[PDB]
Amino acid sequence: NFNGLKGTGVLTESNKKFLPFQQFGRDIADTTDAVRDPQTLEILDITPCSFGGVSVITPGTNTSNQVAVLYQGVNCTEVPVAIHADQLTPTWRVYSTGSNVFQTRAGCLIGAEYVNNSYECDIPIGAGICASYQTSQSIIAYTMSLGAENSVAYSNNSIAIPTNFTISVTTEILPVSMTKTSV
Amino acid sequence: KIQDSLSSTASALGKLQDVVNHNAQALNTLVKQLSSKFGAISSVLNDIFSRLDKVEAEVQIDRLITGRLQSLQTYVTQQLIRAAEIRASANLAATKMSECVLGQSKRVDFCGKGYHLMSFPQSAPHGVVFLHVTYVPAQEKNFTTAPAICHDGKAHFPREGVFVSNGTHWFVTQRNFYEPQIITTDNTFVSGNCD
Amino acid sequence: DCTMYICGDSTECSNLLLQYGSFCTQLKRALTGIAVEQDKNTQEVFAQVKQIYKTPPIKYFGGFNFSQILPDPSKPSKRSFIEDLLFNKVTLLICAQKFKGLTVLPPLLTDEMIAQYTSALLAGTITSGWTFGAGAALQIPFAMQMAYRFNGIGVTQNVLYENQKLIANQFNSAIGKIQDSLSSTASALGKLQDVVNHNAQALNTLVKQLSSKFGAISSVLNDIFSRLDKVEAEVQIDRLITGRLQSLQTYVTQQLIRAAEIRASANLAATKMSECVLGQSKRVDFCGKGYHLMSFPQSAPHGVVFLHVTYVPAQEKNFTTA
Numbered sequence: 084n085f086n087g088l089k090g091t092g093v094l095t096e097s098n099k100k101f102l103p104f105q106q107f108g109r110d111i112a113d114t115t116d117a118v119r120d121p122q123t124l125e126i127l128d129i130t131p132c133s134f135g136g137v138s139v140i141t142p143g144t145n146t147s148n149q150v151a152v153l154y155q156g157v158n159c160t161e162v163p164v165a166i167h168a169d170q171l172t173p174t175w176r177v178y179s180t181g182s183n184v185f186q187t188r189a190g191c192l193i194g195a196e197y198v199n200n201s202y203e204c205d206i207p208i209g210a211g212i213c214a215s216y217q218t219s220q221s222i223i224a225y226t227m228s229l230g231a232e233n234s235v236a237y238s239n240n241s242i243a244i245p246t247n248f249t250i251s252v253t254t255e256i257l258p259v260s261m262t263k264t265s266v
Numbered sequence: 267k268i269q270d271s272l273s274s275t276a277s278a279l280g281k282l283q284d285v286v287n288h289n290a291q292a293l294n295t296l297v298k299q300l301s302s303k304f305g306a307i308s309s310v311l312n313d314i315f316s317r318l319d320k321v322e323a324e325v326q327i328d329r330l331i332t333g334r335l336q337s338l339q340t341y342v343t344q345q346l347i348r349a350a351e352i353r354a355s356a357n358l359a360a361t362k363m364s365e366c367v368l369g370q371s372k373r374v375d376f377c378g379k380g381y382h383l384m385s386f387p388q389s390a391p392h393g394v395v396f397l398h399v400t401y402v403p404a405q406e407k408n409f410t411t412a413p414a415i416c417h418d419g420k421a422h423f424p425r426e427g428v429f430v431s432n433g434t435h436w437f438v439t440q441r442n443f444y445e446p447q448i449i450t451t452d453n454t455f456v457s458g459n460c461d
Numbered sequence: 462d463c464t465m466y467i468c469g470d471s472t473e474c475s476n477l478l479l480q481y482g483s484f485c486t487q488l489k490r491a492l493t494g495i496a497v498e499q500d501k502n503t504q505e506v507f508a509q510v511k512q513i514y515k516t517p518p519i520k521y522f523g524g525f526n527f528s529q530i531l532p533d534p535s536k537p538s539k540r541s542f543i544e545d546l547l548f549n550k551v552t553l554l555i556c557a558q559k560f561k562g563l564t565v566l567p568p569l570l571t572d573e574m575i576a577q578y579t580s581a582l583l584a585g586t587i588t589s590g591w592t593f594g595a596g597a598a599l600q601i602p603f604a605m606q607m608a609y610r611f612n613g614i615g616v617t618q619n620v621l622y623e624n625q626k627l628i629a630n631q632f633n634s635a636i637g638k639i640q641d642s643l644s645s646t647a648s649a650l651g652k653l654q655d656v657v658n659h660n661a662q663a664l665n666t667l668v669k670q671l672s673s674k675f676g677a678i679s680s681v682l683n684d685i686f687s688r689l690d691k692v693e694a695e696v697q698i699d700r701l702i703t704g705r706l707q708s709l710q711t712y713v714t715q716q717l718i719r720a721a722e723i724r725a726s727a728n729l730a731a732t733k734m735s736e737c738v739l740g741q742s743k744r745v746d747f748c749g750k751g752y753h754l755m756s757f758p759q760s761a762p763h764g765v766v767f768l769h770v771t772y773v774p775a776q777e778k779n780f781t782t783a
């Protein structure tokens with residue numbers, strides 16, 4: 084509370100050089116982010132507190148009820164520091180001290196182990212990571228699988244010619260119309 | 267095998283299934299919207315009359331007539347976008363019907379994977395389903411080949427085919443099927459020296 | 462983020478906002494439709510092959526020199542020569558918008574394995590011709606594969622062999638000019654430069670909009686509650702909530718129009734990759750001016766680049782016919 088300039092954030096020290104008459108510094112969005120303390124004349128810097136988004140990984144309710152929350156776009160060395168009482172908007176803080184935390188490019192994951200082997204995607208995450216429910220059952224996070232690798236023998240003088248064939252039938256579905264309505 | 271494949275699971279018909287879902291769900295939000303007060307005294311209309319006189323009720327009823335109208339405006343705009351999407355999908359179906367049904371299409375990977383022979387249409391709720399019939403080569407074998415052959419000091423080329431030899435004698439055969447044949451001038455044509 | 466953008470770090474603004482209903486539970490729903498869609502378009506253009514083929518170490522294709530577009534092991538990334546120029550030609554403190562809840566998410570397929578698909582398509586179209594797009598791959602000598610393409614154009618296959626040395630030199634020189642010519646003019650990447658511009662410029666207007674008064678006294682929420690009584694402070698605030706909120710629904714509407722347009726372009730690109738790469742198309746000008754022979758794909762930021770190879774007749778002479 085600086086002469087009525089109420090707000091909320093974390094205050095640090097800055098090297099900005101206010102002129103003798105200048106007191107407040109604004110930004111592109113036209114809001115206060117630089118104030119000078121009335122008693123001791125120093126140039127503080129104001130930035131809002133940390134935040135982010137929450138996403139939950141879960142199989143169907145028919146399967147097990149285990150879950151694994153996600154915190155989008157935040158360094159994962161921050162929310163474990165918030166292990167106290169009544170400091171975060173979510174109240175299910177039992178998972179703050181959950182399973183082995185894992186760090187990704189889109190935040191960090193709580194409740195899964197980063198296995199080595201790779202399968203096709205089941206639950207998209209981001210940056211080539213997809214979680215799944217494998218086998219004694221558990222939730223795991225792994226890396227993309229682009230399909231089985233193969234090589235074709237190329238030579239200056241050789242050719243392959245099929246000696247047989249097969250006939251297959253493939254389906255295809257396309258929408259044509261939607262429900263007519265009026266109001 | 268197509269009989270049980272359709273009934274094997276439930277996510278096979280996902281494309282048509284969510285079309286009706288995306289319309290009914292939009293209606294529910296529109297219906298439930300009118301219960302919002304929009305910050306005024308009361309959501310329901312007639313209640314806001316007996317509780318006030320007839321001078322400041324206008325600002326208290328304007329909010330209940332713009333929100334009930336602006337929300338309706340938002341829903342209509344959503345329909346326009348989806349209509350502009352179905353129109354693009356419907357035209358593709360007409361092109362598929364005009365090519366993969368009434369004829370044989372040379373365009374690759376357009377009427378099913380692999381070489382295309384014919385397709386059959388089937389009706390569906392708010393959609394159509396095709397059955398592409400395709401031809402796929404089976405197992406093959408390695409071979410030794412040469413581009414041209416020089417016999418009378420002159421080169422010859424396969425008229426329709428490719429030269430092939432099993433290590434003992436040379437033959438010419440089809441591109442997509444193994445049917446070796448004896449070399450033949452009527453099966454080839456001469457052009458230029460073989461040097 | 463709904464609440465923070467409208468009611469910045471304010472508790473008395475939030476509860477008043479709750480009276481407006483479920484207006485912005487649609488924004489989470491609507492935007493996620495776009496987010497999921499963008500992870501589908503990329504998967505519908507590069508993922509048409511389920512076998513990751515690799516090029517042989519030997520690069521002697523009867524004289525043709527493909528080393529220009531093959532991946533380079535020396536570079537830490539598996540990016541070819543041409544693919545590296547594209548990244549340098551595309552430009553992606555401005556990231557202070559994080560403080561107003563304007564988050565940006567990363568794509569599912571990051572750039573590193575995107576080129577891996579491109580390597581697979583390039584490798585499988587030079588050792589197996591086009592048969593690998595219809596089932597089992599079949600190896601064919603590249604020097605004689607061109608004979609089939611010439612047959613499709615209309616010229617007999619004999620013509621190719623008589624000028625094998627001449628045709629290779631002319632094609633090899635052609636690809637060399639592409640490297641410098643791409644970086645010669647600055648408007649070559651215009652169709653991609655505007656995409657990153659539009660999707661970045663529009664955010665600035667959204668941030669700058671909340672600095673307007675919209676008929677109130679001040680543009681900051683804190684002073685109003687600390688200077689005016691609660692009975693009528695709801696009048697000025699209501700004049701401001703409807704201001705910012707309306708400016709937000711405009712932004713989401715713009716996104717839908719652009720998203721509905723990109724899909725109409727990705728599908729066209731998918732057909733181009735399916736036809737002009739995995740086979741020879743008889744359509745005119747669909748895969749470049751002149752008679753079509755082949756084409757190679759190259760990855761790019763938020764797009765793809767094609768390299769069509771076409772046949773064009775040179776000088777002629779007039780005759781008399783019956």
Ligand SMILES: *[C@@H]1O[C@H](CO)[C@@H](O[C@@H]2O[C@H](CO)[C@@H](O[C@@H]3O[C@H](CO)[C@@H](O)[C@H](O)[C@@H]3O)[C@H](O)[C@H]2NC(C)=O)[C@H](O)[C@H]1NC(C)=O
Nearest residue numbers: 409410430431432433434435436437438445446447448449
């Ligand atoms: C490559 O293909 C050629 C063409 O089929 C093979 O040559 C032919 O092989 C058949 C089967 O052995 C021969 O038929 C039999 O030959 C014996 C030889 O004594 C004869 O007594 C029988 O009455 C019967 O005709 C056929 O003659 C032969 N033709 C020629 C021109 O040699 C050849 O064996 C194949 N090479 C391989 C598989 O390595």
Ligand SMILES: *[C@@H]1O[C@H](CO)[C@@H](O[C@@H]2O[C@H](CO)[C@@H](O)[C@H](O)[C@H]2NC(C)=O)[C@H](O)[C@H]1NC(C)=O
Nearest residue numbers: 245246247248249250402403404405406443444
């Ligand atoms: C090409 O493949 C077909 C498919 O397997 C082969 O047909 C089989 O032939 C055997 C022996 O006559 C039968 O026991 C199988 O029942 C056939 N399968 C089917 C699906 O009918 C055919 O023989 C193969 N071609 C050659 C030359 O062997």
Ligand SMILES: *[C@@H]1O[C@H](CO)[C@@H](O[C@@H]2O[C@H](CO)[C@@H](O)[C@H](O)[C@H]2NC(C)=O)[C@H](O)[C@H]1NC(C)=O
Nearest residue numbers: 234235236237238241242243406407408409410
């Ligand atoms: C015989 O045909 C095979 C293909 O069916 C050629 O390729 C060999 O077999 C498999 C193909 O995936 C590979 O595991 C082998 O390593 C391939 N061999 C080599 C040397 O690479 C094979 O080359 C052909 N052999 C001959 C003599 O023509």
Ligand SMILES: *[C@@H]1O[C@H](CO)[C@@H](O[C@@H]2O[C@H](CO)[C@@H](O)[C@H](O)[C@H]2NC(C)=O)[C@H](O)[C@H]1NC(C)=O
Nearest residue numbers: 520521522524525526527528529542633637640
């Ligand atoms: C394919 O073309 C490239 C480009 O000209 C060749 O690489 C050049 O090789 C010469 C000497 O061989 C060097 O002086 C250049 O600096 C190289 N340039 C680049 C961009 O690498 C390459 O040798 C050719 N490959 C074949 C098989 O002919």
Ligand SMILES: *[C@@H]1O[C@H](CO)[C@@H](O)[C@H](O)[C@H]1NC(C)=O
Nearest residue numbers: 142143144145146147148276
């Ligand atoms: C749950 O799974 C079991 C076994 O797969 C099955 O029998 C049951 O019908 C499933 N229930 C639901 C609601 O999907």
Ligand SMILES: *[C@@H]1O[C@H](CO)[C@@H](O)[C@H](O)[C@H]1NC(C)=O
Nearest residue numbers: 157158159160186187190191
């Ligand atoms: C958090 O920041 C530090 C600062 O260097 C960095 O090393 C670390 O990787 C960051 N955490 C994550 C999960 O990226």
Ligand SMILES: *[C@@H]1O[C@H](CO)[C@@H](O)[C@H](O)[C@H]1NC(C)=O
Nearest residue numbers: 196197198199200223224225
């Ligand atoms: C993956 O393999 C490496 C071997 O380099 C090993 O050190 C690591 O523990 C493995 N990861 C898991 C989850 O087993």
Ligand SMILES: *[C@@H]1O[C@H](CO)[C@@H](O)[C@H](O)[C@H]1NC(C)=O
Nearest residue numbers: 237238239240519520521523
């Ligand atoms: C094909 O085989 C090798 C591959 O390195 C090549 O050097 C050789 O010249 C070619 N063979 C013929 C007959 O041209």
